[PDB]
Structures are given as C-alpha cells and as structure tokens.
Design an enzyme around this catalytic site. Structure first.
Site, PDB file in Angstrom:
ATOM      1  N   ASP A  55       0.856  -1.025  -0.051  1.00 37.48           N
ATOM      2  CA  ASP A  55      -0.201  -0.262  -0.061  1.00 37.48           C
ATOM      3  C   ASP A  55       0.816   1.279  -0.025  1.00 37.48           C
ATOM      4  O   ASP A  55       0.562   2.121  -0.794  1.00 37.48           O
ATOM      5  CB  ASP A  55      -0.954  -0.056   1.105  1.00 37.48           C
ATOM      6  CG  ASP A  55      -1.765   1.158   1.290  1.00 37.48           C
ATOM      7  OD1 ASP A  55      -2.529   1.555   0.566  1.00 37.48           O
ATOM      8  OD2 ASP A  55      -1.246   1.908   2.486  1.00 37.48           O
ATOM      9  N   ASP A  58       4.357   1.185   4.226  1.00 32.82           N
ATOM     10  CA  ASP A  58       4.174  -0.042   5.018  1.00 32.82           C
ATOM     11  C   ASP A  58       4.140  -1.380   4.215  1.00 32.82           C
ATOM     12  O   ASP A  58       4.190  -1.217   3.074  1.00 32.82           O
ATOM     13  CB  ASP A  58       3.086   0.148   5.943  1.00 32.82           C
ATOM     14  CG  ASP A  58       1.812   0.336   5.407  1.00 32.82           C
ATOM     15  OD1 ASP A  58       1.523   0.729   4.158  1.00 32.82           O
ATOM     16  OD2 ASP A  58       0.576  -0.229   5.815  1.00 32.82           O
ATOM     17  N   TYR A 206      -7.665   2.693   6.565  1.00 32.77           N
ATOM     18  CA  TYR A 206      -8.513   3.170   5.138  1.00 32.77           C
ATOM     19  C   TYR A 206     -10.041   2.891   5.826  1.00 32.77           C
ATOM     20  O   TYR A 206     -10.857   1.942   5.058  1.00 32.77           O
ATOM     21  CB  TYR A 206      -8.127   2.350   4.210  1.00 32.77           C
ATOM     22  CG  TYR A 206      -6.888   2.516   3.478  1.00 32.77           C
ATOM     23  CD1 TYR A 206      -6.730   3.676   2.430  1.00 32.77           C
ATOM     24  CD2 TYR A 206      -5.687   1.858   3.981  1.00 32.77           C
ATOM     25  CE1 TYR A 206      -5.507   4.239   2.097  1.00 32.77           C
ATOM     26  CE2 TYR A 206      -4.659   2.453   3.397  1.00 32.77           C
ATOM     27  CZ  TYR A 206      -4.291   3.433   2.583  1.00 32.77           C
ATOM     28  OH  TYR A 206      -3.269   3.780   1.902  1.00 32.77           O
ATOM     29  N   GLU A 424       5.420  10.584   3.340  1.00 30.67           N
ATOM     30  CA  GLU A 424       5.059   9.070   2.939  1.00 30.67           C
ATOM     31  C   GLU A 424       4.559   9.168   1.592  1.00 30.67           C
ATOM     32  O   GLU A 424       4.398  10.245   1.013  1.00 30.67           O
ATOM     33  CB  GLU A 424       3.925   8.638   3.887  1.00 30.67           C
ATOM     34  CG  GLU A 424       3.646   7.137   3.387  1.00 30.67           C
ATOM     35  CD  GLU A 424       2.955   6.263   4.613  1.00 30.67           C
ATOM     36  OE1 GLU A 424       2.346   6.777   5.659  1.00 30.67           O
ATOM     37  OE2 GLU A 424       3.634   5.159   4.740  1.00 30.67           O
TER      38      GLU A 424
END
Ligand SMILES: OC[C@H]1O[C@@H](O[C@H]2[C@H](O)[C@@H](O)[C@H](O[C@H]3[C@H](O)[C@@H](O)[C@H](O[C@H]4[C@H](O)[C@@H](O)[C@@H](O)O[C@@H]4CO)O[C@@H]3CO)O[C@@H]2CO)[C@H](O)[C@@H](O)[C@@H]1O
Ligand SMILES: OC[C@H]1O[C@@H](O[C@H]2[C@H](O)[C@@H](O)[C@H](O)O[C@@H]2CO)[C@H](O)[C@@H](O)[C@@H]1O
Ligand code: CA
Ligand code: CA
Length: 605
Positions: A55, A58, A206, A424
C-alpha cells in the site's frame, strides 16, 4: 518544449509501482533492490494470496486503495493511450495493471467472497525493515455475504472492468476473465450491502468514511463501459441520486475530491461525459469551480506558491487527482472560459509537484531539481536495526514516488523520513498523478530516458564477518568474531551460515592437544579442528539454524568468541585467517563466511 519532462516523470512513476510489488518477483525485475516477499500470504486460509501491491511505506496489502489505484491507472490509459505510447511506457502500464489484476483474481475464489486484506496494520507498523525479511505473521481477511463490503467489492469490480478495456485488444481472453469477475463482484456488492470496515480491521487506516453509495455508481458506470450493457448505465444514473449532499443544501458534495474513499466526484464528470445531461454538468462545474474560482465565496485553500492544499495528509495527491479529472472534463465541456480554467489549473498543480514552486524543488523522488531523498518507506530506507533513524539516508532511490508535500498553505516542507503525514508515499498517491502525466505527455510531449533504471551498487559489504583479538595470549589466539547481515540489494535471510578460520600448524604443536573453547558464543562451539593438507588446518563455527537478517539489533548479527589454545609453540603469525586482525572490531577479509556451503565473504587459502 514542455516545462518539465512529463515523459520522464511518467516513466519513473511506473518504476515506483514495480518497486511496490509483493510476492515472487519475475526474472525481468527492474528493481535490483527488491526480492521475493510475502511468500506465505494466504497460507492461514489455505489460499495463495501472494502478489499484489504494498500500500504505502508499510507492508499491509489494503484492498480498498489498491483497487482504486488500479481503476485510476486504467482510466488514464483509456483517456490518453497516446501519452503512454509516446513516453514508451504503455508496456509497463499494462505490466503493472496485469500484476495487480492477477492478484485480484487470486483474491476472488468464488463469486461472493473477496479477500480484501493480508496483514495486520498494527503488527506490521511496529517493525521497521525490508519487506523480504518481515518476521511477523500476516493474517488474511475477507468479506462474504455473512459480513459484506459493498465499497471494496464494487471498487474491485470497477478496477477489473476498467482494465479489461485496456487489455481488450492485446489479450481478449484476459479481458474477458476480468469482465466475468467484475460482474460477480458488482452483483455481490449490490446484493449484500455493507461497509467493509465493519468486517475487516482496516478502519484505522482506510475507513470507509463515505459509505458505498459512491462505489455503486462508480462500479456500475465502469461495468457499462467494459460490457456495453445499457442496463448498467441505467443502474449508475439511478444510484446517482442517492449520493451525499452537503451540510444543509440539496446540492451534492463539492468541497473535497476524488480519492480512494469518495468516487462521487469522478462520477459527476464521467456521467456528464457519457450522457451530456445538465444535471451532471452542474455538479461537475460546482466542484471544479470550488477548486478554481470558488463558489458562494468559498474556495479550496491556496498557498502563495499556487498549490491547492485540501488537507494535511497527502496534499499533493488530492491536488493531483483533481488535476487529472479536470483535464478529462476540460475536453468535454464546450465553455471556452471553463475549459481554459480547468485545463490551466491542472497543468499548474502538476507543474508545482514537478518543481515549479517557491522551493524550486521536485516532490517526485528521483526526479527533477532537489528531489526528496528520505521518504517514509521501509524497504527504500533499508534499515537493518529496526530503526527509522538509522541509517541517516534511505539506502535506495524510490524513483517516481510522489510525496505528500506541504500539508499547509505556506509552501513549507522538510524531507523528514519520520514524517508520514507529509513524507510518505503510496500506490494511490501516484494514481491520479500518473493519469495526469499521460494526458500531459500527449499534449506537451517529452522523451523518456534511454538508460533507466540505473543499477545501484551496495553501500558496502552486505553480509560479512568482523573480528578483533579479544584477549592477548601467547599459547592461544582468542578471537571475537561478529557475523553481520546488513543486506539491501536485496535484503536476505542468512539461516545456514558457517565460517572458517584457517591456521598453520606450528613446530611443537600437536593437533591432538589443540582445543577450541568459548565463554560466549551465540553459535555452536566445535570440539575438534580440521586438517586440510600439510600444516593447514581450520576451525569451523556452525551458525545454521540462527536466523541472521537485517531487521533488528540482535537479529542482524551473531557474536562468536572463540579461543584456539595450542600450547607452547603456538604461533599465529603464519596463520592465514589471522592476517589483519587488530584490537578494533573490523571486517576480516580472511575468515570465509558460507551460506549453505557457498562462500559469501572472505577469501580462502
Ligand atoms: O470529511 C471530509 C471528507 O473526508 C473524506 O475521507 C478522508 C478522511 O477524512 C481522511 O482522514 C483520510 O485520510 C487518509 C489518507 O487519505 C490516506 O492517504 C492515509 O493512508 C495511510 C494509511 O492510513 C496508513 O495505514 C499507511 O498505509 O500509510 C497510508 C499513507 O500515508 O490514511 C489517512 C487516514 O486514514 O482520507 C479520506 C479520503 O480523502 C471522505 O471520503 C469525504 O467524503 C469527506 O467529504
Ligand atoms: O498509521 C500511521 C503511519 O504509521 C506508521 O507506523 C508507525 C506506527 O503507527 C507507530 O505506532 C510507530 O511508533 O512508528 C511507526 C513508524 O512511524 C507507518 O509506517 C505508516 O505507513 C502509517 O501511515
Ligand atoms: Ca465511498
Ligand atoms: Ca601458526
């Protein structure tokens, strides 16, 4: 000539997606620092769920955003196939889409069962190291009629549908298979209603904040396109009226944008493009105006530098998603003024991300001037001590990755790896961005780099042995050896290691009397020595069974102290492995380390 080489950016974007892959990587792998990982995904449920995409920075495989990314990527390829052709990236796009779609098939073992997640968010986030050596268990979660997930299901249907169109000419067979799966998933989603985050533990990452209504419209529309079945368009238009309105008015939401959770905005433009109904045009207009000139005095926050900042987390992603859709809408609307506004807005937002800002720096890793060097990404960093702080700089260049960027309307940003809110990267971050890039390549041109990707070379020995004299002695040689596994090209386990310390028999030293002891040894301590030929002998330390890997302080290394007592006459000066060993721990080139009998470090006599 284009302000920025969009073709290059696109070319790198595709590389990023390849770096995000999970499962058994192909022989043609372009990312030299990526190896096989998540090889036991699905084992817990007796299924093969290897493959797919990690994703973000991570390693949990979140189905919801993974499906959305796929749809946005396909969408852009349908809008501007020429952009992908020109930049020579069309084969890579198809390759990436094939990768994620194969996984989706693996995850759909029956019509009403869809695996939406592999990995636990918390456990996965507690460890910081390369994907190839993840030491935690990875549970597989699913949704079925007993606990549905209309959002994720309908999105996966949209994903497979949209892609079938891309493969239609190349692989009609494949295309058909995606379409077949898509119908089942959409049916499952429409029949068994529910929010997937009520069934799988993804709510903290999410969460389905908007519900499934937007996905029912979104999915329907895409199945319509892949099948051509008019009933599907009918389904979409009907469901459209049940979309979220805003605060108190009967006006449909217009203050946010399309992203992995809310597809309302996409549908406004898609149906407007398809039907041409004023109803859709009004919604699309109100939304895109709020992002440009404003509506009723309200307007999305703008920085002095020209960036539309919608939120703190992944700001550039939102602006990029809007930039893409804006370009798409810009081609269908006839209004010269609106067409200019939307189109110009899009180019500006993309250009800002590519370098046209107050900092005059790129926000796309590995691209442009002064790009980010330390995004929040585990495998890219290459830590071997389970620390986000060490090493200082990410050991790999995650080419093509779009960072979150400035979270506030002040054009400020700091390339801090520990800032996951602004630094990120993610599969969905590049989804809308890539589609916009393809549109811009078609229009403004650009040329890809002939020699890409560059082949990174390790930043030193990866797996080696360090040594130093532990205690000075004249009738013995006591060594302090330290096995190390700081691998990153790619990270690998070293579970069958052994090393040899060769020494020469001295005059007066009877091999029978030689002893090998230790006061501290994390590996085995041998009883006897091994005669090779003549006066050459060697001590073999056995570390098989010990899992030495770059994922922790004690995990990446094994300390082995060993004393070879030979009695009076013992002389280490003529010993092979003794050459170079001083009083400071340092790499010992003459102690050979073997992985399952194969030499990995050092030189033998
Ligand atoms: O109410 C306004 C608006 O909200 C929309 O939903 C937002 C939601 O409010 C917001 O919190 C959420 O933020 C996400 C972010 O988009 C996502 O990129 C990020 O992903 C993380 C993940 O959580 C981590 O586990 C790890 O994998 O890294 C990634 C990347 O950093 O997570 C945050 C928090 O979940 O975004 C939603 C979508 O924009 C509604 O959709 C809309 O309808 C509302 O109007
Ligand atoms: O979900 C937010 C963010 O978390 C990151 O992992 C954190 C973890 O949540 C925290 O408990 C621990 O102390 O630090 C790690 C590293 O920052 C994760 O890496 C991100 O992907 C995620 O977006
Ligand atoms: Ca939704
Ligand atoms: Ca000797």
């Amino acid at each position: 000539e284009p302000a920025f080489n969009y073709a290059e950016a696109l070319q790198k974007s595709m590389f990023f997606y390849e770096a995000q892959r999970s499962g058994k990587l192909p022989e043609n792998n372009r990312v030299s620092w990526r190896g096989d990982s998540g090889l036991n995904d699905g084992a817990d449920v007796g299924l093969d769920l290897t493959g797919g995409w990690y994703d973000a920075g991570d390693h949990v495989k979140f189905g919801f955003p993974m499906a959305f990314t796929a749809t946005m990527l396909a969408w852009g390829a349908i809008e501007s196939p020429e952009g992908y052709i020109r930049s020579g990236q069309m084969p890579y796009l198809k390759d990436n889409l094939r990768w994620v779609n194969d996984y989706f098939i693996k995850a759909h073992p029956s019509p009403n069962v869809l695996y939406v997640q592999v990995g636990d968010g918390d456990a996965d986030h507690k460890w910081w190291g390369p994907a190839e050596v993840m030491p935690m268990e990875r549970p597989s979660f699913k949704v079925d009629p007993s606990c549905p997930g209309s959002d994720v299901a309908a999105e996966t249907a949209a994903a497979m549908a949209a892609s079938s169109i891309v493969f239609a000419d190349d692989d009609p067979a494949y295309a058909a298979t995606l379409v077949q799966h898509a119908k089942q998933l959409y049916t499952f989603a429409d029949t068994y209603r529910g929010v997937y985050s009520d069934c799988v533990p993804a709510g903290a990452f999410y969460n389905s904040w908007s519900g499934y209504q937007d996905e029912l419209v979104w999915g329907a529309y895409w199945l319509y396109k892949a099948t051509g079945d008019d009933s599907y368009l009918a389904k979409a238009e009907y469901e459209y009226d049940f979309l979220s309105t805003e605060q108190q008015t009967d006006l449909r939401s217009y203050r946010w944008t399309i992203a992995w959770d809310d597809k309302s905005y996409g549908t406004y433009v898609l149906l407007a493009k398809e039907t041409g109904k004023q109803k859709y045009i009004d919604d699309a207009n109100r939304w895109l105006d709020y992002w440009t000139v404003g509506v009723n005095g309200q307007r999305v926050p703008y920085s002095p530098g020209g960036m539309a900042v919608l939120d703190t987390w992944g700001a550039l992603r939102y602006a990029a998603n809007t930039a893409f859709v804006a370009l798409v809408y810009a081609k269908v609307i006839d209004d010269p003024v609106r067409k200019q506004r939307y189109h110009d807005f899009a180019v500006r937002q993309i250009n800002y991300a590519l370098g046209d800002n107050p900092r005059n720096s790129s926000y796309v890793v590995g691209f442009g001037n002064n790009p980010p060097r330390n995004p929040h990404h585990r495998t890219a960093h290459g830590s071997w001590t389970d620390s986000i702080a060490s090493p200082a700089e990410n050991r790999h260049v995650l080419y093509g990755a779009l960072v979150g960027g400035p979270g506030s309307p002040n054009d400020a940003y700091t390339d801090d790896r520990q800032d996951y809110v602004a630094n990120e990267v993610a599969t969905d971050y590049n989804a809308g961005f890539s589609s916009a890039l393809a549109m811009l390549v078609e229009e403004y041109g650009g040329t890809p780099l002939a020699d890409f990707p560059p082949t990174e070379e390790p930043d030193g020995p990866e797996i080696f042995v360090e040594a130093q004299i532990n205690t000075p002695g004249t009738t013995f040689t006591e060594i302090k050896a330290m096995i190390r596994n700081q691998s990153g090209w790619p990270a690998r386990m070293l579970d069958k290691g052994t090393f040899r310390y060769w020494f020469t028999l001295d005059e007066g030293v009877d091999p029978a009397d030689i002893t090998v002891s230790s006061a501290y040894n994390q590996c085995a301590t041998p009883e006897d020595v091994h005669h090779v030929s003549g006066d050459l002998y060697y001590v073999e330390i056995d570390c098989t069974g010990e899992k030495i890997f770059p994922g922790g302080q004690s995990e990446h290394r094994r300390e082995v102290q060993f004393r070879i007592a030979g009695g009076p006459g013992w002389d280490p000066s003529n010993d092979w492995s003794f050459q170079g060993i001083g009083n400071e721990l340092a790499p010992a080139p003459y102690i050979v380390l073997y992985d399952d009998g194969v030499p990995v470090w050092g030189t033998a006599p």
